[PDB]
Design a protein around this ligand. Sequence first.
Ligand SMILES: OC[C@H]1O[C@H](O[C@H]2[C@H](O)[C@@H](O)[C@@H](O[C@H]3[C@H](O)[C@@H](O)[C@@H](O[C@H]4[C@H](O)[C@@H](O)[C@@H](O[C@H]5[C@H](O)[C@@H](O)[C@@H](O)O[C@@H]5CO)O[C@@H]4CO)O[C@@H]3CO)O[C@@H]2CO)[C@H](O)[C@@H](O)[C@@H]1O
Ligand SMILES: OC[C@H]1O[C@H](O[C@H]2[C@H](O)[C@@H](O)[C@@H](O)O[C@@H]2CO)[C@H](O)[C@@H](O)[C@@H]1O
Lengths: 1526, 67
Amino acid sequence: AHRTLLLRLSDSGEPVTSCSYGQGVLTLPSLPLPQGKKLGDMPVYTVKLAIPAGSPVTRDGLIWTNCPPDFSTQFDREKFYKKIIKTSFHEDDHIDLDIYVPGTYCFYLSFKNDKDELETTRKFYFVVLPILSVNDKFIPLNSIAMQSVVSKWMGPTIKDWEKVFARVASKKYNMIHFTPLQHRGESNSPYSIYDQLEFDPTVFKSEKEVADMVERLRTEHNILSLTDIVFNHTANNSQWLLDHPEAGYNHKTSPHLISAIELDKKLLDFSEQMEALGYPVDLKTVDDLIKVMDGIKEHVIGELKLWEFYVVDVKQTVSELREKWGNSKSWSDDNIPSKDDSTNLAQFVRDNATEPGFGSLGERGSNKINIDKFAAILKKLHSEDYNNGIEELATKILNDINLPFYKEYDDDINEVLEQLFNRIKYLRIDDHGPKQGPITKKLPLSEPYFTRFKAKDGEEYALANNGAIWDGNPLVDFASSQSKAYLRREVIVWGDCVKLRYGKGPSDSPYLWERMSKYVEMNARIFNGFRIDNCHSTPLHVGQYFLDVARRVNPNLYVVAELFSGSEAMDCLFVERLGISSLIREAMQAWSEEELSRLVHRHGGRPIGSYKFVPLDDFPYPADVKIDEEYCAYNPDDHSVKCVSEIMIPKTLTATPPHALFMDCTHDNETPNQKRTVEDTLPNAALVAFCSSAIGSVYGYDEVFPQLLDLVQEKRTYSCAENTGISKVKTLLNNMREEIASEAVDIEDSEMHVHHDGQYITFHRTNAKNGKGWYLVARTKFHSSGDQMLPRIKLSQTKATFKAAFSLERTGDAPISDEIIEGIPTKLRELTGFDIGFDENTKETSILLPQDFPQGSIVIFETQQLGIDDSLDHFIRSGAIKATEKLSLESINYVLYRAEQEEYDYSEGRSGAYDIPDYGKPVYCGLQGWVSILRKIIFYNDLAHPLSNNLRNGHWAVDYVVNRLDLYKDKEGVAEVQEWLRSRMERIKQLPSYLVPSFFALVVGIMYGCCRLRAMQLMSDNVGKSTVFVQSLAMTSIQMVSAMKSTSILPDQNIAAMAAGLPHFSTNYMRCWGRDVFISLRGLLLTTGRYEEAKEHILAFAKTLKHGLIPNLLDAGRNPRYNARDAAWFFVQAIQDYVTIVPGGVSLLQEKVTRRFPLDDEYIPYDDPKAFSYSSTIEEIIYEILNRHAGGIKYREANAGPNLDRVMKDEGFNVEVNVDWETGLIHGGSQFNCGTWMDKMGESEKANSVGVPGTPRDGAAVEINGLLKSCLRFVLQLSKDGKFKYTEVTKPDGSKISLSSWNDLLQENFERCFYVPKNKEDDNKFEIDATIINRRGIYKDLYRSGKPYEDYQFRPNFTIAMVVAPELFTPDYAAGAIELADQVLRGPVGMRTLDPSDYNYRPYYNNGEDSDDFATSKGRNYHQGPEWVWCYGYFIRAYHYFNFLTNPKCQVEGSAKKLKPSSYLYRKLYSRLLKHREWIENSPWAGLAELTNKDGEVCNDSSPTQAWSTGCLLDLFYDLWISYEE
Amino acid sequence: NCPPDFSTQFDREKFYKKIIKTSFHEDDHIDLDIYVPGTYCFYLSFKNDKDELETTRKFYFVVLPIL
Ligand SMILES: OC[C@H]1O[C@H](O[C@H]2[C@H](O)[C@@H](O)[C@@H](O[C@H]3[C@H](O)[C@@H](O)[C@@H](O[C@H]4[C@H](O)[C@@H](O)[C@@H](O[C@H]5[C@H](O)[C@@H](O)[C@@H](O)O[C@@H]5CO)O[C@@H]4CO)O[C@@H]3CO)O[C@@H]2CO)[C@H](O)[C@@H](O)[C@@H]1O
Ligand SMILES: OC[C@H]1O[C@H](O[C@H]2[C@H](O)[C@@H](O)[C@@H](O)O[C@@H]2CO)[C@H](O)[C@@H](O)[C@@H]1O
């Protein structure tokens, strides 16, 4: 059906963690194949790789992976296959990896670097677990019960072994771990394997003999089998070690150990003649201890030549100086240090005149000096004649060279004998190991560090034997040249075993790799898996190769490993590359009760009430996505991985901690009888069995054997005594886990709580799906530590049921037989007296233990959380899509957003946002306010967050989500969304309190994603198919477009009105601004597809025309202050954008509005019969704007006075506009007016700025004139097609000018007036006064301005003209001018409003400063430094256009021979949008800010989400889409 | 760069798509309807043996005027 997982990648190709589970591995969940399907009928899993659009990896990117393309192809570690990444600046690319067989798979990405070179990422691995079945019943990996049995203690017959099989089958173990069933070595230790390819001749005689026995275990007792596989060593008496001695490290293969060889055979030879002089041959005195140390000091150390292995032979080098003095005898460069600095001169010969391998160990005289270069230096430093003090000088230098080698020797020798008398002490003088036997040939004082033998070839070789250094990184081969452990005697050896020298591959040891390969695949044909002892000491490349050979034989190979590397990161890396399926954890390692509770806590599961993952505001919602319309397209027989909700966003693949196999006792650790007591066997195994993982035990733990069985010596056989000790309880524990294994699946599905009080340990296993759970109270018996009483156990909203209870008591000591390993007689008494009280009011269960509950006892309770059944998950994950069926792009605003000021409008100031105690209020009243807070909470499972605490303290926030929609119930689809929330929140309140936070965030997250998907479906294709960043930008359209009660765009009705920004531009007269609305109209309404909403805004604002201008402040239809010279031209530009984009957009021109003002610029009140009066067409409105400007405007603001503006002076109200008809430019404004987008009127009475504009833009502004040229071009081609009637324009005196002539006037004079030439020799043709100038190569910001220096200020306003009227700019002038803005005026998110090099530059805006500074006080800096985000949009829109025309590197051949931008340009565009994507990601408001202080500094006064901030970035994405993506 | 119909004007650099019907047996025939005399050219794009995009030369043909 659907076995697909989503693996999202970052911009650097690294996998993205969906949740924080800790250091882990991309493991895919172990699930059975579909009903009646084998390996190869279909892919086991499909990993959907998601690459971000426009990311640096997409540039000529390829996905490499060693995943075979089909089931027919075998797996190869180093054969990677190509996959092409479909590059796009809008749409992410998805690449499927079909996997047909479990194993280890990795992937890396290759791409074109920014240096046009090739670059490669890391290799990222992911493990597909094997499928474990016995006959035809699937065995979940976390329900494995493994019984480890040692071969040599099971009897001499195959049927005598099958007696042991029946015993462990009654205890209901489902897996048996075998110590290697091969022919054992001399010492008969199970791990010293004589021959790897031959089984034990005593029991088996063929491979089929063991294969039939293992298959018998499968069909008879329903038990799988696996063995140990030994890679690191082999027995010291293998006949192939004689035939092929190079398989281990010897004096030929590893020459550095020659020094350690001559020391090992110097001690076996010493211990054999030791007794002759032996003052303390075998004693236990303090004087005895020192006398053997003196014997070591004098009999071997003094007889080992002072060790020339380090020291250069002093006199034998001087002898080799006179011998050929007269050959190569000359040096050159003066870098030879003076003899005064003896240290520098001594090491200078070390770096220059030395033989290969200086410092390293090897042969006896391994460290040597190159004589021919040394004598050449001696002749250059002292004299060419030898007798001139060379014998003195050459010896002085060599002695100084050997000074560090001598101190390297004294530090080595001290560690040689300190390790000796500290090891001989414990071995002989019994501290904890009684073994003071007289030195024999079997047991000398020296442990054989090297196994000596005579081979074929003639030579007598000397291989060593592995072991373990006490402390040290296990990744360092103690036999390799990097370690000095065999020399300094820092190795605890195993004489039974012998080195296995693998190299970099099969080339260093051919026969060893071929033998181990055939040895691995032999056991792979028979058994179900392997066990690797000390896997951390086996090299990676060695373990990788052989485990892959095994998986080719047994595709369902189950790998266990005792892995204790340096850290958790190295443990995960070994699990990643080797394909380990389970890690061994030992419960006997816990020294105290608290360490056991912490060990059990690590492998028990997740906390109770843990948050569930949901796609939120960080996912793409493709409008064309498949949907489980009622979460019903699932069949239990398909065994498909489920999506999170009705939306079919597949299950995310995230790193999870590697699976654990918890062993209550292995075959190497001491018995509970030894480390603790025998009674602890019951509570220890119960705590382990309750963990949500695989469990196991060694044979004898359940049968309470007295002490740890010596794997080397002991020959006794396991007892056939049945049903001893815990055998009854393990049958219960394993049978109970079989009931749980049927439904428990992933990591979020099993929860846990563990408590430790004194000697008691509490375990509460809970299934998060149905609410069924187990409660374990286990009193541990580490020591007999007196009576302890456990307090009253309290379970909230839960009912408990007694299951079973036992006590383990000791009845004397164990028998002492020489034939049979018999355990300690124990009584298993069932317990009673447990009182389970249930309060029928508070629904609280209390549990009291009886006083007869001795240490070493347990009691298991079956428990069930109240309010949860099996049908709870389906009821929450269904119906939300049908509930959002009737939602509109307007109605989604009330479900998801609504600021507190917007909510006060509908609620008259009564409601607002829910206040979270000890935190604050969410940013929006809708679901977005919750999602913005919950995403970080769900990611970290922060159950201690103030919101998490409040959710389980009561149902206030639960009812708040449902009760909000009463304000907007009458709107389209909101009622059905509220009913889905009402029914689901009602069902949630019936749950336990501690489970409400996880379920509250799940219901809110599901409805949010359905509302966000519904939005992408209602929008256009370019938005509903793009990256999260583009869709997040598009959701700002829903944040701003809303219906209100205190304001609107129409004076007679209350309809949808685009707000300027939230929350400070949303209510009353502060909401609608004509300048802002039509700058954002193309991005928020046209790019998104809200064509009808864009028409309503154009028509409504057209009604409020006056003075041939559009009002800055639109109060619906009453008092619309006309303080704007900028607004009317952005308005007429939005009309062109409407007609250009909307199909049949020319119909807007003939739309009849009811112009609420007379043609003559007068003043009619709201209630006036002359308000409706006449009708106006958009054709007429556009012409009225063009001709009124040309004909000369003349007006003073109506109702001027303190009532209008409390700061504007009287002369400021009379602002005017006229067209200079020699240039075509539209000038206008005064130094007392602020009629541009930089609208800041001073209001500081302490700085004396009241009424003084901070940025008065009087004269010709680049924005106004650029929009004028675009409007003229639009109406010219409009008449050429027959859509515009008017073609004449009258000038103030009375003459007529054709509209074409006005367009030609600007075309011929715009660049001449504004452009500042970069060379001073061209200043004579561009109307420039060079005395007042800042930088050259700049398009001016103003023309004929009141302040002449403000004319030449570098401001981002010229880019608006570059976007709307590119014909006014010669390409090379515009490209160089906009490159200056990129280096100087471009901030990280916002565009610097003023050149930082200017003297008026104050980039910090703090409206509320009461100082005497003419700028900082009362926020006059508004547009004099601060970085605005919308100007960034117009900047990059023209940065892309003019770099595409100028720079030849920004162009590449396209289909149909249309010039398309290069990846070099897309790379530069993508980089300049990273800060915007980070901003909208990590902001509580799901948008982009209005303003930013200097260099990205957050401005508190800035509105956190602004309409035209995100709308101008959507303009760029639509530009690249509508022009190239065809 | 042949216009699709007589209403569409001629552009030197605006080329139009035509799909080649691949077959191992049958050749494909693609018609180029010309409505006005002038200079017309055609080139072919295809998937290279390197799985890349490759283009042939521009091949011109002249339709003489009617006098
Ligand atoms: O209903 C009648 C109406 O009459 C009066 O309205 C006028 C104001 O008195 C008058 O000052 C003016 O308001 C203008 C202002 O002159 C102009 O410079 C501009 O102001 C900036 C602010 O300087 C700036 O700080 C910022 O204000 C934000 C602030 O940063 C933010 O942190 C938060 O506090 O919200 C503030 C806005 O509420 O941005 C603005 C806007 O760019 O624009 C102002 C609005 O046009 O002209 C008004 C014309 O009606 C009375 O004063 C008013 O109370 C009456 O309701
Ligand atoms: O010239 C006054 C005008 O420009 C200043 O900028 C430059 C100036 O253009 C240079 O000639 C020289 O004087 O360095 C000045 C910067 O220190 C001021 O920045 C500007 O505010 C002023 O109006």
